[PDB]
Ligand binder design. Structure first.
Ligand SMILES: *[C@@H]1O[C@H](CO)[C@@H](O[C@@H]2O[C@H](CO)[C@@H](O)[C@H](O)[C@H]2NC(C)=O)[C@H](O)[C@H]1NC(C)=O
Ligand SMILES: OC[C@H]1O[C@@H](O[C@H]2[C@H](O)[C@@H](O)[C@H](O)O[C@@H]2CO)[C@H](O)[C@@H](O)[C@H]1O
Length: 246
């Protein structure tokens, strides 16, 4: 398991949590030096447990699919909650079996469905460490509209931060003040899968991408990623989604 506490949290301990979150994910190959996530893992070992503690010391445990860094659901006191999706339903046969009930949320984990449930796109949802504190607190007592938005915070401050160093850095800047994510942040989130694919495909194409990727950059500019010498590949991405899951 990995575990982050918001009390005493500062950019340092957050970064160290995000470091642990990346290191808990297993892999047997790096591709251009980037850990490559497994095509699949079997039974309970597919699932990473994150213990998260809000500023007051209350806690949820979040189950993460180690092959893709998707949140399956979480344990809040004695009630387990899981997205309405086959993967999460699978996950529920291995994690938090001893919860007193299990609730299935009325949406999948997809950013699109979570946005409808929340009634606002990610662009307009502040994120940061204080926002991650709100979100932990929310998920402690069921409320599905509120949870949509608490989960969109949670995905971005954990999973999306572990995937990209840039988004980890965006969170660390917001240690004490929330802020809507930059467009570049939405851009990377949306591109994770195509980047993972084109990183893997570059490797017998002399590090050239078969299909270029369009991103927005940190300065709000549209930019095009064409091979593995780009900063996105060299510095930014930290985990690759296996093409055997794309
Ligand atoms: C791989 O992508 C790099 C960009 O990171 C390409 O080099 C860039 O492309 C043109 C010049 O050819 C310029 O717009 C950029 O300023 C270049 N940037 C840097 C930092 O060199 C490179 O051409 C691509 N590789 C191939 C074979 O096309
Ligand atoms: O979309 C971002 C969101 O991905 C979810 O994955 C969705 C997937 O994109 C969609 O095809 C399907 O309906 O549900 C998937 C979940 O199994 C993740 O669940 C979530 O954590 C974010 O990564």
């Amino acid at each position: 398991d990995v575990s982050f506490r918001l009390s005493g949290a500062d950019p340092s301990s957050y970064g160290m949590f995000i470091k642990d979150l990346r290191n808990a994910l297993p892999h047997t190959e790096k591709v251009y030096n980037i850990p490559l996530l497994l095509p699949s893992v079997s039974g309970a070992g597919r699932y990473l447990l994150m213990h998260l503690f809000n500023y007051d010391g209350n806690t949820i445990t979040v189950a993460v699919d180690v092959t893709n860094v998707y949140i399956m659901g979480y344990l809040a006191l004695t009630t387990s909650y899981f997205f309405n999706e086959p993967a999460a339903d699978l996950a529920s046969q291995y994690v938090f079996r001893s919860a007193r009930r299990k609730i299935t949320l009325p949406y999948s984990g997809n950013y699109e469905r979570l946005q409808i449930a929340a009634g606002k796109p990610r662009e307009k949802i502040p994120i940061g460490l204080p926002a991650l504190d709100t979100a932990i607190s929310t998920l402690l007592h069921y409320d599905s509209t509120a949870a949509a938005g608490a989960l969109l915070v949670l995905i971005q401050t954990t999973a999306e931060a572990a995937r990209f160093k840039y988004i980890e850095q965006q969170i660390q800047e917001r240690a004490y003040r929330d802020e809507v994510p930059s467009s570049a942040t939405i851009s990377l989130e949306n591109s994770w899968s195509g980047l993972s694919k084109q990183i893997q495909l570059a490797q017998g194409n002399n590090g050239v991408f078969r299909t270029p990727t369009v991103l927005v950059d940190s300065k709000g500019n549209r930019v095009q990623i064409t091979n593995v010498t780009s900063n996105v590949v060299t510095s930014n991405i930290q985990l690759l989604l296996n093409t055997k899951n794309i």
